[PDB]
């Protein structure tokens, strides 16, 4: 069933941007969704998303742009110990020149660059690039 609500959503926003779809809604919604999408907003990977408030769960509607090649999700949230952060961002991103492993540490949800500035580890969620 709905186990992981990212994988759910991120499939459907990778899986639109292939078709070139202009915008998409994501059915279940969550806090973690919002908080990881707002990360994608900063590096440009999407445009402004506007969350509907069906009284229950939430829907979102994501303005897409052309720019997202793929976003995916590492499904079990392994615990990343900062020394490993490299070994991951080697084998999970296309280059050292862009690509963003979104993860979730002590000091909020954020990309790997921002966990490195603050010097924290934590749990991998996914990656967009």
């Amino acid at each position: 069933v709905r186990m992981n609500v990212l994988a759910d959503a991120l499939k459907s926003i990778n899986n639109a941007e292939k078709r070139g779809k202009r915008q998409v809604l994501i059915r279940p919604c969550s806090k973690v969704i919002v908080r990881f999408l707002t990360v994608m907003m900063k590096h440009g990977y999407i445009g402004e998303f506007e969350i509907i408030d069906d009284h229950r769960a939430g829907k979102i509607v994501v303005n897409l742009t052309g720019r997202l090649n793929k976003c995916g999700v590492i499904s079990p949230r392994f615990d990343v110990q900062l020394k490993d952060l490299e070994k991951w961002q080697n084998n999970l991103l296309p280059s050292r020149q862009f690509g963003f492993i979104v993860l979730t540490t002590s000091a909020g949800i954020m990309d790997h660059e921002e966990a490195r500035r603050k010097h924290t580890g934590g749990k991998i969620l996914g990656f967009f690039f």
Partner: protein, 141 residues
């Protein structure tokens, strides 16, 4: 698909464990059989006594007689055919003469022709065929 979860380190380990008794190359190595079966008791070469000289008929596409030796190994008393490599060297080896027999390179496969012959002769009465068939060291007497 695969089990993929996070407290699934065992279902995984124990999965990748048994699905090696379906590997062939480990069930030689880790089972028992091999050490029990190969006259060469896990041992690179072995010494044995030449009990007679036997020509073997090669596998159809290539007709020829191969010129091997029935050996009996010391350590086991297990018998053997070993193809005496290189031309006219069977001529050297006489009966009842102590030979150091090594493998063929296929470790169990019989090589090419020589149907069902894993072993090749190397030494003969502490000499080495390579020295004899070159004519460097003569036959001892």
């Amino acid at each position: 698909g695969k089990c993929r979860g996070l407290r699934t380190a065992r279902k995984l380990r124990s999965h990748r464990r048994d699905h090696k008794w379906h590997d062939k190359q480990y069930k030689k190595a880790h089972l028992g059989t091999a050490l029990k079966a190969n006259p060469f008791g896990g041992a690179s070469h072995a010494k044995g006594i030449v009990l007679e000289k036997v020509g073997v008929e090669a596998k159809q596409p290539n007709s020829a007689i191969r010129k091997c030796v029935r050996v009996q190994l010391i350590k086991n008393g297990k018998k053997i055919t070993a193809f005496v490599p290189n031309d006219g060297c069977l001529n050297f080896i006489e009966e009842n003469d102590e030979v150091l027999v090594a493998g063929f390179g296929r470790k169990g496969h019989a090589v090419g022709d020589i149907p069902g012959v894993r072993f090749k002769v190397v030494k003969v009465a502490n000499v080495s065929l390579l020295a004899l068939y070159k004519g460097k060291k003569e036959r001892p007497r």
